[PDB]
Amino acid sequence: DIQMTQSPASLSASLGETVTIECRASEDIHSRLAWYQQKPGKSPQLLIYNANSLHTGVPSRFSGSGSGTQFSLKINSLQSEDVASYFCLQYYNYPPYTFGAGAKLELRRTVAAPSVFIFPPSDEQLKSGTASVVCLLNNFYPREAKVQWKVDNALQSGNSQESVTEQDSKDSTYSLSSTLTLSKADYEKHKVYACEVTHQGLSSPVTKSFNRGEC
Amino acid sequence: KMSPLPTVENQFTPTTAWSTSVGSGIGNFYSNLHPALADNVVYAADRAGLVKALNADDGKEIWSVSLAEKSKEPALLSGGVTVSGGHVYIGSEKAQVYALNTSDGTVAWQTKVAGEALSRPVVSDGLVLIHTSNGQLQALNEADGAVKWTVNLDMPSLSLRGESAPTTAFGAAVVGGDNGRVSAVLMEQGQMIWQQRISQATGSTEIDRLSDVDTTPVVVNGVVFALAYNGNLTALDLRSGQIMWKRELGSVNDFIVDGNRIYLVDQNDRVMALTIDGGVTLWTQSDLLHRLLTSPVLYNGNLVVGDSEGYLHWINVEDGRFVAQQKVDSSGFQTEPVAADGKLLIQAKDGTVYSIT
Amino acid sequence: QLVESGGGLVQPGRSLKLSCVASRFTFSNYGMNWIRQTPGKGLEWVAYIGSTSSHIYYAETVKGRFTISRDNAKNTLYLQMTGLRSEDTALYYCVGHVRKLGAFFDYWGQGAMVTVSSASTKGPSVFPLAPSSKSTSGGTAALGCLVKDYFPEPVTVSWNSGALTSGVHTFPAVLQSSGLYSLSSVVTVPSSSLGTQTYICNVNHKPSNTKVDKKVEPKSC
Amino acid sequence: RPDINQGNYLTANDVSKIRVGMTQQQVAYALGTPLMSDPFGTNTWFYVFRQQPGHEGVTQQTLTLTFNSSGVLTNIDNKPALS
Amino acid sequence: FVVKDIHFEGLQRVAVGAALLSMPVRTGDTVNDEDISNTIRALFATGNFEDVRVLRDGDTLLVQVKERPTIASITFSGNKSVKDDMLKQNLEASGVRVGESLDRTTIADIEKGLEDFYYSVGKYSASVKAVVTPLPRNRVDLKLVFQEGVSAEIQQINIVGNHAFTTDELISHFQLRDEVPWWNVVGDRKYQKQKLAGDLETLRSYYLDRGYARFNIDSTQVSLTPDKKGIYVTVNITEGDQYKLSGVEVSGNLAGHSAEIEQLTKIEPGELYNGTKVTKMEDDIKKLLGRYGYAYPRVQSMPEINDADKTVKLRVNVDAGNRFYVRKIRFEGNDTSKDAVLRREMRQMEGAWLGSDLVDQGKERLNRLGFFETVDTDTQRVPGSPDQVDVVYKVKERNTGSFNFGIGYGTCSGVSFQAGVQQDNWLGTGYAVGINGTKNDYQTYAELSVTNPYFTVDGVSLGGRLFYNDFQADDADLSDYTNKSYGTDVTLGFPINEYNSLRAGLGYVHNSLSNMQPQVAMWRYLYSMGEHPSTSDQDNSFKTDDFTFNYGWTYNKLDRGYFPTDGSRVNLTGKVTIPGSDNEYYKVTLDTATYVPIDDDHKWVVLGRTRWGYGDGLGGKEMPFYENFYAGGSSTVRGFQCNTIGPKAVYFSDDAVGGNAMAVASLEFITPTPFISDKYANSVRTSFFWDMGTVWDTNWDSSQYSGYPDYSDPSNIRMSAGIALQWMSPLGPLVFSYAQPFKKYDGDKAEQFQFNIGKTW
Amino acid sequence: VPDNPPNEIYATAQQKLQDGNWRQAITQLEALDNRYPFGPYSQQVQLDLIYAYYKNADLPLAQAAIDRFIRLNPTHPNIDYVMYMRGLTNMALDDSALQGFFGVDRSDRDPQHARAAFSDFSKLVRGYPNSQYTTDATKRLVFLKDRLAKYEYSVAEYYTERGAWVAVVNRVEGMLRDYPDTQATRDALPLMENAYRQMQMNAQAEKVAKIIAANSSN
Amino acid sequence: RYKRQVSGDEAYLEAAPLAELHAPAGMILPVTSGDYAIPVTNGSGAVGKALDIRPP
C-alpha cells in the first residue's frame, strides 16, 4: 500500500468563513487524487476529479489546491448544510487503491446546555430480574461533557454504556444516553442513584437522582 | 594554324607621331569602314551613330555629332568614308544614306536604297554610283541623294560579304560581284557593255563559291586585273575583258600595282611581286603565314602593313625583306589605313587612331 | 437504478453469492468494484473488474479467494465469496466508474452489510421509558421505548406510523457483553401532550420477523 | 453507365428518294454500301438503324431488299421500327 | 604475238575464267589488238586489279596481274560530335565499304566529301586526312585523322524593309540567337539550316496576325568571316501596311449542319486578321465531322481582299467528303496480354457509324493504364471502298509488376524483411494482385490481395484481401508490444460515369494483444473502454475482433498513368465500424495529386500533391491507436524517417506515437535531363519539391499534465525540401532522394539520402 | 581474334557445333565472315549462322539474314530448307514460354506472325511439294488454322458478351469463306441463332436450324 | 547483361484431327475465299523430332 494521509481530524466552523482541509501524499505525485463526500446515512458522492477539477452541478466555492506532496481542499464562503465526511482517494497506484481517513465535518453554533433526564426501569423489566437506569442529555453543544453516575459515592465504569446521536440538522445539538445496567437485585442494593452532568453550556454541574422510583 | 614571330627588326627606327582614343570602337566585329582626310582635317566614327570631325596636324575636334532615335536605337554605320565639296556621303546597314556637311555635323540630305552598306561609294567626273549586299545597284545625285536609275543583279545563297569596289573608265563603269560574274556597263543607264567569267566550277556547290565574291580589282591603262578567294588571278582587257594571262591563285585582300609590277599577298599570307603583263614573280617573302593581315599603302617610297595582332610589318620594297618592326596596338585591325600628302595613319578596332611618322 | 441482493447472516467459512443490477446506462463498459467500509471508519477496496470481465484485479486481503463476474444481458454483477471470517463483516458497496477519464467512480451502491456470526437471530424486546410527573409539566418531557437483546441488525423504528416525527432521538446501538444489541429510542414532546397523545413506537426486526407496536402512556410510579 | 449505336445510318428522308427498279450500283452512288448480304443466294441487302442508349431504352429502324440476278431490284420491306 | 592459250598469275582473290572473260579475245588464232586495252580498262574499271602486265611467249599469253588490296578496317581519329555510322553512310555514298579494294587516289575526294559533311554540320575550318596501313593477304587498314577546327557564332541579324516597326529585339523569340547572356547560359549562337526555315515562317506568322496580308520577303542572304568565326545574316522584306477583315462566308455540301458551324465561324465584324485562329477553326470543324462520321473533306480559305480599305472577305469552301463507316479493327502489341481486354475500354465500337473522338477516348483509356511503354494508333482505308475504313491500335507492351522491399527503414517495421510483389496485368490477364510475406525469424506477416476489375462486364470490379500476422519483439521486454492479428477485406467497385468511380466493401479482423508497454497516453483509449491496469505493471493482454465496412470515391482524369504529365487523380476512402462490433468509430483518408505542364514541349511541368487523414467515433467509442495515422519515411515526407513524426512517447520518453489529425503537402518543380538520350530518358523522371507536414490530436490535452507540452494544434510544422529522381528498372520502380530539413521542433530526426521501392506515389 | 585461312576457323566451327557450344562458335563465324566475305563456302557459313541464330534464338538477325540471302541467292537446291526455316523463324517469333506452364491458352495474341508463317509454308509447299520438310509443316499449318480460329472465335465471344450482334456476323461470313473446319466454326451457328433473334429475323433462323441439323451434333 | 531463356522447344505440340463440313439439301455454305487454301498431298517422310536440322 502507501500512506494515504488525511489531516487533521473532524472539524467545526461557522457559516461564511473558508476552510482548508489537508490530504498529504507520501510519494509526492501531482493530480493523482479524487475527493468524495459521504453524507450520514447517505451514499457517498464525488466532489473533485483530477485533484483540482470540480464535478458538474455544484458551486464554484470548492477548490483543489496543493502539490503532489500535499493537497488541500478549499471552501470559500461556505454556506448551509454541506456537513458530511470527506475523503481523498489516490489513483497513482492502480493495484492498491488507498483512501483518506475521512474528515468528519461538524459546525460551530453557540454553546447549548443539555437537559438532563433520568429514567427508572420499566415495570415490564421488574418481572425480568434486571433493571436499566438511563441518563439523558438532550440538546447540548459542544459534545464534550463529563457525565458520571454516582451511587453511594461510586464511579460506575465498564457497566455503563453511552450512545451519542449525530449533530442535528435543525438545532445542531447533540443527545447522549448513558445507560447504567444493573440487575433488579442491585437496584434495591443501593439507595440513591445519581447522574451528574458537567458541560460547557451549563452554569453548574447538574445532578439529577432518584431514590425510590420517580413518581 | 598560325606561324610564330620571326626576330624583331632593329633596322630602321620605329617612329610614331601622335595617337588618339576615338569613338567607342567597333570591336571583334568585321566591317568595312575607315576614316577620311581633307585639307587640314580628318573625319571618322564607330558603328554607333557617333561621328567626329578632327584635324590633320593636331587631331582636335572641329566638331562631333551623333544620331539615333530620341528610342535611341544605335545606327551601326559601316558604309564607306568619302567626301566631296565640303560634304560627306555615307551609308548604313539600313539602306539609309547620309549626306552631311564637313564644316558641321549637319545634313546635306538623307535618302534610301536597297541592301546593307558593306562597301564604299565611288565617284568619277561626278554622279556617284553605289552598290550593296543585295546585288542592287543604285545611281545617285550629289545634293539631294535622288536616284536616277537602278539595276538588279544575281546573288548566291551564301558568301563572305561579296562586295566589290565599283570602278569607272571613259565614263564606262565596271565591277565584279558574286556568282563569279563580272560586268562592264554604262554609267548613264548603267546598261551592259559586256560581262565575263574567270572562275572554274569544279566543286560541289559549296566551294564553287569561294570564287563567288570578288576581291577589289583596279584598272591601270586599257587593262584590269582581278581575283577571288581560292580563285583565279586574271589579266583582262578593259574594252572586252579578254584574257592577257592567268595564275591559279586565291586571296581576299587588295593589291598594289606601282611600276611594271604588282605587289600583293597570298591567302596563306605570303607576299610577292608579279609582273604587270606576265604574272611572273619577281620575288616573294614567305614567312608570316595565316597572320590575319591588312591591305598596304605607299608612303614616301615604301610599304608597311598591320595585322590582327596590331604590329607593323615594315619591309624593303625590292624584295620584301623586313626593314623595321613596331608593336603599336593590342587590338589588331579589321579595315584599311590611308595616307595622303604627307601624313600616315590607322584606326584600331577598339576606337583608337594612330597618327604616324 | 441499482438494485442489489441482501446481506443477512452467515457462518465464518461459508460462501455467498451477492448480486447487483444495472438499469439505465449501457453497463457494457464501466469498470465496477466492490468496496467495503467498516463502521470503525475503515475504507477498503476489495475488488475490481474493467470494461468487461477480461481484467479482474483483487485487493491484498482476499488474494483471489473471491470471484466477481457480470452478465451484460441481465445487467448484473455476481460476487461469490469463498472462506469467510469475522473481519470481512462490513458495509459493501457496488460501485461504478467514470466514463472517458476513469480510475474513479460515478455511481455508488446502496451498501450491503454482511454479518458472519455463530449466534442465532433474536427478536427485540420493547420496554416503556415513561417517568410521569418530571420536572417539566408545561415544558417538554421525553419518553421512549427500549429495545433489548436483539440480533442481528437492523431494526426499523417509527412512531405512530410516521405521524409523530418531531423531537425524536434514536440512540446508536451498543453491543452488549451478551453479544446482543440494545438501544433506546426517545422523543421529546411538550408535557401537555402526555396523556392526550398516544406515543406508539412500531419496531420491526426483519431477520427475526418481529413486529412490535408498543404504546407509551402516562403511567405513574 | 454506357451508350451504344449500331447499324447503318439513315437520313429518314433518303428513304423518300427510294424507288424500285434501280440497279444496285445506282443505290451505291446514292448511298454507299450495305454490309449485310445473303451468303445463301437471294441477291439481297439490308440496312438497319439500331441504338440502345440509357440504362433502359431500345430503338431500331430497318429497310430490307431483294434484287434480281441482274443486280436490279425486285422488292423492299421497310420496318420503320422494331419488335 | 600469236597465242593458243592464256595463263594468269598473281590473282589470288578472283577467278581466271572471269579474268579471261573481261578481255574479249579470239584464242587459238592471233588475238586482237585490244587485249592490252581490255586488260587495262576492265581490270582497272573493276577497282579490283592494281596493276596488269601481259606478255606472249609465242604459244601462251602470260598475264601478270595483281589484285587491289581490300580494306579490312575503317577507323576514325578526331571524332567529337560525329558518329561513325553516318560516316559509313557517307562512304556507301562514296561507294566504298569493308571488304573493298580501291585506287588510293579518291582519298582526296573522300576527304572532300567528309569536309562537305563538315560544312553541312556548320564547320568549315576542319581538315581530314587518311592513314593507310598496308597488310598481307591483299589487305589494308585505314584510319582517319580529323582536325575539326571550329564552328562560328552569329554576329548580326539586320533586316531590309522592317521600317515603321522594330522587331530587332523581338526576333529573340526564335530558335536562333544573336545574343548569349552570360547569366542565361546553356547554348550559344550557332547557325542551322532548318531552325532558320522554321523561325522565318514563324515570324511571318507573327506579322500575319498583327493585321497583315502582304508581309512579304524579298530574299534571304547569309555570309561569314574568312576565318570562319562569326556569321553575318541579313534578310530583305516588305513590311507593307496593315490590313483587316470584312465578313466571312463559306460554300459546300453539308447535312444541314449549318447552324453549328455558324457558331464556330461566329466573329465580330471589323476585327484584326489572324491566321492561326482560322486553322484551329477549320480543325474544330474537322472534329465535328469526325463525330458525324467524316474523315476526308477538303477545306480552303481564300482571302478576297480590298486593299482600297485594307479589308478582306474571306471566301471559304468546303468539300464534305462522302460518308464513311468502319469495316474492321485490328490490334498489335499482344504478345502476352489478351485482346478483348482493351476493347472493353474502347468507347469506339465496330460495325457502325463513327466518331474520330471515340477513337481518342479509347486512346485515353489505354494510356491510363501504364501497361505499355508506348502506344500507337493508326487508321487505314480499305481497298475498293468509298465509305468502309479500317483501323489499327498498336502498342508496345511493358513489364509492370514489382517486388517491394520494406526493411522497416527508420523502424516502422524495425529490423525486418517485408518481401512482396504486385502485378496488375497478371499473366496478361486483367487480373490484378499484390502480396507480401514478412519475416524476422520470430514475427510473421503475410498478406494476399486480388481484384478482377472486370469480374463481370461493364467494368465490374471485385476484390479480396487476407492477412495473417504475428508480431514478436518482446522477447527482450522491448517497446512496440506484441500483437497477433489476422483478417479479411472484400469489395465491389464500379463506375457510373465515364471517369468517376465508387467502390465499397467489408472486412473482418481478429486481434490479440500482449505485453503492452506501460506507455502512458495510450491508456486513454483503454479508459475510454474501461480499464486501468498499470501502476507500471507488465502482465497486460487483451483481445478483440471486429467486422467493418468501407467505401471509396474516385476522380481520375489524366493523359495517362505510368509517369503522367497532365490532369489529376484523387482517391478518397471512408471506413467505418458497424453495429454489433466490439467498438464504434469511423475515419476518412484522402490522397490527391495533379499534373500541369507549360506546353508538354521541353516538358516543364508542375505537380501539386496533398493528403488528408482523420477519424473519430461515437458512443464513447474512439478509433484505436494502432489504427493511428503515422508520418515520415520519405514516401510521404521526404527527408524524414518512417513514422518518426509528431508527439513523443510517455512513461510514468521519446518515440513517435501516431494520432488522428493530419495535414501534409509538397510542392514541386518537374524537370527533364539533357545529359542522357531519349532511349531511356523517356523512362525516367526527376523533380524538386518543398515539403510540409504536421499532425496532432484534438482529444489530446495538456491543461492537466502540463509538465510536458501540448501536442494538440495544427501548428508546429515539419518542413524540409529537396530533390528526387525516380527511375524504372526491371525489378520494379525505384527512387532516391536527397533533401535538407530546415524546420524541426525538438525530439525528431531524419536522414538526407534516402531510398524507396515499389509503388511510388 | 586470330588470323588464319578460313579453313581452320571453319574446322573449329564444326567442332564447337559438335561441342554444342554457341557463344564461341558465334564469334568464330562472325570473324570468318569479316575475314573471308567471299570464301568458297560462304553459303555454308550463312547456313551455319542461321542455324546458330536459331539454336541461340538471336531472332531478328536471322530474319534479316534469311531475306537478304534468299534475295541475293535466289536459287540453289537447299533453298527449301530456308523457306521452312523462315516459317520456323516466324513460328518461333509468335511463340514463347517465359509464361508457359501446363494450363495456359496461348491464344489471343499478336497473330500476324502466324499469318506470315502461313504464307511462308504455303509458298514453300507450292514450290516444293516433294521435299522432306512438309509432313510436319502441315501439322503446324493445321495448328495455325485452329489457332486463328480460336482467336477470332474469342473476338466473336467478346462482342457477343457485349451484344455486338452484327459486326460479329460480318466477321463470320468471312470466317466461313476461310474456315470450313474447326468446331469453333461449328460452335458459331448458335451465335447467329442469337443474332437473328436480336434482329427479329425469323426467315434466316430456319437457315440456322438447317445448318445445325446439317452438322452432326457431337 | 543478356541472360534469360526457356527450355523445351523442338517440341511437337499438336494432336489435332482434320475437320470440314458438307452442306445441306436445299441451301448453301458460302463460297470460300481462295486465300487460306490447302495444297494438300499425302505425306510420308521425316516429321517431329524424327527429323533433320543439321544443315547442308
Residue numbers in the entry:
A (entry chain L): 1 to 215
B (entry chain B): 31 to 100, 105 to 391
C (entry chain H): 3 to 223
D (entry chain E): 29 to 111
E (entry chain A): 24 to 675, 702 to 810
F (entry chain D): 27 to 244
G (entry chain C): 30 to 85
Sentences copied from the publication:
The folding and membrane insertion of OMPs is catalysed by the essential β-barrel assembly machinery (BAM)2–4 which in E. coli comprises five proteins (BamABCDE). The major conserved subunit, BamA, is a 16-stranded Omp85 family member that contains five N-terminal polypeptide transport-associated (POTRA) domains that extend into the periplasm to scaffold four lipoproteins BamB–E5–8, all of which are required for maximally efficient OMP folding. BAM exists in an ensemble of conformations, with one of the most notable differences between published structures occurring around the seam or ‘lateral gate’ involving β-strands 1 (β1) and 16 (β16) in the BamA barrel. The POTRA domains are also dynamic, with motions of POTRA-5 also occurring alongside changes in gate conformation, with POTRA-5 plugging the entrance to the BamA β-barrel lumen in the lateral-open structures, but moving aside when the lateral gate is closed.
In contrast with BAM-LL, the cryoEM structure of the BAM-LL:Fab1 complex (at 7.1 Å resolution) contains a single structure that is in a lateral-open (contorted) conformation, consistent with Fab1 biasing BamA’s conformational equilibrium towards a lateral-open state in which POTRA-5 occludes the barrel. Conversely, the Fab1-bound BAM-P5L complex produces an SDS-resistant band, consistent with stable binding to its lateral-open state. tOmpA and OmpX folding assays revealed that the addition of Fab1 to BAM-P5L or BAM-LL each resulted in increased inhibition, with folding yields of ~10–20% for tOmpA and 5–10% for OmpX after 3 h at 25 °C, and initial folding rates of only 1–4% and 1–6% of that of WT BAM for tOmpA and OmpX, respectively.
